[PDB]
Amino acid sequence: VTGDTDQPIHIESDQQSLDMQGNVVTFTGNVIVTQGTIKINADKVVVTRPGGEQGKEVIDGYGKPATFYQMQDNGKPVEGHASQMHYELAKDFVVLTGNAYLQQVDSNIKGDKITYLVKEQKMQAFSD
């Protein structure tokens, strides 16, 4: 949605490593990256800040597959998956690589129980 790329980025994982040379942090274990409605899931996430220059951070997610979600202004979520997510914050786009897939959802529903017909239904009509 509008404003998503102005939000703080939260990255949660089971384990985190700090490269003692600075500017690289690695997350492993059910990593979730959130920025507004943006959500990336991955097994490992590498955050780099080249030269300590904030605003030029790069977030790389790796998974089998990693997954991507965002809500759009028009109400339809966008969902994707790939072996790797590459998000340069300076560029405002995400690159999915490796068996990459992206889709847009136009309808959904939740319940404790949902029935769904797996055979198509035929026109019901009759004359006198």
């Binding site: 790329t5 102005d6 939000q7 703080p8 980025i9 939260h10 990255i11 949660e12 994982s13 089971d14 384990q15 985190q16 942090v25 997350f27 274990g29 059910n30 920025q35 955050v47 904030q54 605003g55 951070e57 914050l89 300076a90 405002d92």
Partner: peptide
Amino acid sequence: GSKPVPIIACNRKTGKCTRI
């Protein structure tokens, strides 16, 4: 982004968070 945003690392085990 229009401006740099904070990046927060959170440990699921402890709930502890820090800016990176």
